[PDB]
Design a protein around this ligand. Structure first.
Ligand SMILES: Nc1ncnc2c1ncn2[C@@H]1O[C@H](CSCC[C@H](N)C(=O)O)[C@@H](O)[C@H]1O
Ligand SMILES: Nc1ncnc2c1ncn2[C@@H]1O[C@H](CSCC[C@H](N)C(=O)O)[C@@H](O)[C@H]1O
Ligand SMILES: C[C@@H](C(=O)C(=O)O)c1ccccc1
Ligand SMILES: C[C@@H](C(=O)C(=O)O)c1ccccc1
Ligand SMILES: O=C(O)[C@H](O)Cc1ccccc1
Ligand SMILES: O=C(O)[C@H](O)Cc1ccccc1
Ligand SMILES: [Ca+2]
Ligand SMILES: [Ca+2]
Ligand SMILES: [Ca+2]
Ligand SMILES: [Ca+2]
Ligand SMILES: [Ca+2]
Ligand SMILES: [Fe+3]
Ligand SMILES: [Fe+3]
Lengths: 333, 335
């Protein structure tokens, strides 16, 4: 209410922007892990160990300090009041900023209808793939590995739709050493990352990747390899199949393109309903706003339940995900 | 713990949403939303989206982002001003500068910090966007101090040079107040030059004002040397820090002195590096200004550092003006 209160709050919003960006960068540059492990670090030492521009490192930590993630004491950076929560959700900040920053930055050019043709926004596919690797482990894994443990069979060939970093295929190969893996992704930067990772991790002879549009799966260049697939996975792009009639038809095409698939594991975030503006939790606003900016439909959880049957699949189990807006894993059959 | 974990949970959610609101402040400024709201206190969302032909779902998101931190409130079909509207709107150009102008620098922090990457063109910002924001930053924060100094020149300028001319608006405004004055803007960015050419055309000053892409740090290789001898007022707003470190600044200032022999008054306005502000009491702008320039490798002097440079640079400081609410910003009157 007061003029002093408004001044602080606006300063906080301004500083939050820099802290937000610094969260994913601090994660990526290794500082969050060190803070988590030791509770404190020495800025100069850190900058020297990691060969970083020290004046910028000071600002990074200052940014974090400005909103209570961290607390500076002389030459020392110490864990702050909000560190565990921020560190828990760090990959969502990375997704927001390092991954998706160019979308949100260009709001004034992306909103006007006359600009909304062809490629009217840009994001960093590799940075998204990187963040999503942790989003997956942090939020979706317990459900994913529960679904994998409940398969009732040992997969031999697995296909992953919107494969990103390729980590899901690697993980399935670590679990089922005989398995062959095929990832489909529409993004060059994703394919590039994934091929690097399977090479580096020793899986190049077991896992391959094709650039293609899972929405039009029957057009994809790897047609002949789909007949041997007996496990299908799709995480964090289901909403891209929408709106509803498109999703139904894509699901029918997947059923037919993948005739030997027994189980199809599908994980995604969904659109929320009725959350107060002042009570929006982490991620939700960015997820929803980002996709509305991109002109991409986001179904609610309710809308998903309705499409599987017409899509030619039976939903056998459904898992709630903790604290990633409203997210879900479906086990389909 | 229970109500404490709830607190940390809402704090971190507020940081995330603030990122979105922050970007929306500049965007809503640019799209005309902030000005409508200041003028009427209220607007109809669908009617706004139609009048400006904007994608309505995205418009709703934009206003949702601003409401999520208290800048506006959504009621039915309507958006109204929130508790923090006046303050955020007051500083709207600073948010635009942070996001629309400089967002690409801050986004690439994990690639900018490593020393191995810090050569050549290791970051990118939006010069045009910066020029646009700076036009309001000048008018809203620097103008009172600027026009007081212009008032006190003791003369009518005949040719003015503006170092880091950006949008061209200072030169335009001096030309409004001093009819038939001549003007020359130097800027190192074509995005500023482009905006400035467009603005002087449109306001019918192409007659009297010209622009050249050059580096004011090395004024003798600025290739509009022909006009310099005639210049009798020098101005330089929001780029003095670029002259540093100290040795470079001393040399540039001396060069300015000799490059512009007929200059009487040199009005120098800039933000400076602060010292000792506690991390949780940083006012708006300060952190972005300092962190940004540290990321770019650009020296930021304190107010004292400037005070100690002028005599060696060939200049006498005769008057200093404090600026309200732009970190620690100042205008020096030099002679
Ligand atoms: N129509 C489409 N066809 C194929 N891939 C798509 C697609 N739309 C989006 N994608 C990809 O889906 C990915 C979403 S991010 C999820 C990455 C990965 N599944 C993981 O769980 O970590 C991105 O890499 C994006 O490029
Ligand atoms: N070495 C250099 N030489 C010339 N211009 C420079 C420069 N370094 C930065 N600039 C310019 O200085 C400007 C600072 S922004 C301020 C613009 C304008 N003076 C105003 O009052 O609104 C930018 O347009 C930037 O491109
Ligand atoms: C990858 C991201 C997403 O949909 C996008 O970047 O377009 C996403 C999906 C689901 C949960 C978290 C992030
Ligand atoms: C334009 C900006 C700046 O230095 C920059 O973008 O590099 C600035 C300088 C001084 C006051 C406000 C903004
Ligand atoms: O309707 C649902 O909730 C999901 O589509 C999957 C499911 C359906 C029935 C029983 C269990 C799971
Ligand atoms: O030294 C200073 O503080 C200013 O740089 C200029 C100034 C000097 C003396 C009297 C007034 C102004
Ligand atoms: Ca990008
Ligand atoms: Ca096996
Ligand atoms: Ca295709
Ligand atoms: Ca109304
Ligand atoms: Ca002093
Ligand atoms: Fe998406
Ligand atoms: Fe600068």
């Amino acid at each position: 209410v007061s003029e002093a209160q408004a001044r602080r709050a606006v300063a906080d919003i301004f500083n939050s922007t820099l802290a937000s960006s610094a969260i994913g960068a601090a994660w990526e540059l290794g500082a969050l892990d060190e803070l988590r492990e030791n509770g404190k670090l020495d800025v100069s030492d850190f900058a020297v160990r990691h060969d970083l521009h020290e004046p910028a490192v000071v600002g990074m930590f200052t940014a974090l300090a400005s909103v209570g993630i961290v607390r500076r004491e002389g030459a020392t950076v110490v864990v702050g009041p909000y560190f565990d929560e921020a560190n828990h959700h760090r990959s969502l900040f990375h997704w927001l900023n390092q991954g998706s920053g160019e979308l949100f930055r260009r709001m004034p050019q992306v909103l006007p209808n006359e600009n909304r043709t062809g490629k009217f926004y840009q994001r960093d596919a590799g940075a998204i793939s990187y963040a999503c690797r942790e989003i997956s482990e942090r939020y979706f894994d317990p459900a994913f590995w529960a679904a994998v443990d409940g398969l009732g069979y040992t997969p031999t060939t697995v296909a992953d739709l919107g494969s990103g970093s390729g980590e899901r295929l690697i993980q399935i190969a670590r679990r089922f050493p005989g398995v062959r893996g095929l990832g489909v992704d529409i993004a060059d930067g994703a394919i590039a990352m994934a091929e690097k990772e399977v090479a580096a991790k020793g899986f190049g002879d077991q896992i391959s990747f094709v650039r293609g549009d899972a929405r039009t799966i029957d057009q994809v260049s790897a047609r002949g390899e789909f007949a041997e697939v007996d496990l299908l996975t799709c995480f964090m792009m289901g909403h891209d199949f929408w709106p509803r009639e498109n999703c139904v038809q894509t699901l029918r095409k997947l059923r037919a393109a993948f005739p030997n698939v027994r189980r199809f594991l599908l994980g995604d975030a969904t659109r929320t309903v009725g959350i107060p503006d002042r009570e929006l939790p982490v991620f939700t606003l960015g997820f929803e706003f980002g996709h509305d900016m991109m002109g991409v439909y986001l179904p609610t959880l309710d809308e998903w339940d309705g499409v599987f049957e017409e899509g030619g699949w039976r939903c056998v189990k459904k898992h709630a995900i903790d604290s990633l807006s409203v997210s879900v894993v479906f086990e389909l059959e």
